[PDB]
Symmetry: C4
Subunit: 87 residues, 4 copies
């Protein structure tokens, strides 16, 4: 019912249903997120910016609220939003 | 003597006596927090915003001080305050 | 040669020598830190603010540089400095 | 093919190829990083500032972009840049 998303060593735990709200995104589509699945550790691994992911995850948890963390510059966060295919 | 609270993968450890100071809150009421308990892991699980939780825990630690962290926007923090029933 | 310091669920790992450099403080004095030792998990446990502790630990690691994390208000951080007996 | 970097208890995970991009840095040089390796913990351990490391990692992830995080003071960050041999 929940999966583990490991962002450069930082492990997040989220419900599958939470991710399923946005099926056109990377994490919302099983076919896209499967490219980052690590079958040996039973988790999805992303070699990316850690401080951005709290906000990416919150976008799903909140049902659509996208906010940039103060400590992540706009150009860096905008690249993460593009990578996670939230537009 | 200690309880584990897992906020989307991030684990917090707090004495039950400290939560018990505020019985009208979610975490201070046995009936309410039981809805989020996981017997296998012996922890409470919330699929919620991570940055906000340091200030939620500080509310219990400080004996009732409610302080918004500078990196958590006011509308987000106010929703977390209402969810955990700290008002 | 290393000890584990658990601040409300957040585990820090520090060389004993790093702490020993300031023997008049809580963590640098064997008798003061012993009050917070947990023989079950072989770690020191503090029911305190998490965001402050990176800075407290960095005071030892850097050989004496004490800086307040931008995300922790001055009154809260000053209370932590007193608790850890850094003066 | 992954490397675990433990900064005072905080674990970071990166692909070895990512560090390998910059062979003249501490983490990109096998001989230099070997001094910090722990065979019994298959990880490299640094007793250093935690908040600075997200930005050290982002230098490798970004293909060489060096960005001072907003809540890490310049003198502290500059010392970490020097220690990891990024310049």
């Amino acid at each position: 019912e929940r999966v583990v998303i490991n962002i450069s060593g930082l492990r997040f735990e989220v419900q599958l249903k939470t991710l399923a709200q946005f099926p056109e995104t990377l994490l919302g589509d099983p076919k896209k997120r499967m490219r980052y699945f690590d079958p040996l550790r039973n988790e999805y691994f992303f070699d990316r910016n850690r401080p951005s992911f709290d906000a990416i995850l919150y976008y799903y948890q909140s049902g659509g609220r996208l906010r940039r963390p103060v400590n992540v510059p706009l150009d860096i966060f905008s690249e993460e939003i593009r990578f996670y295919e939230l537009g």
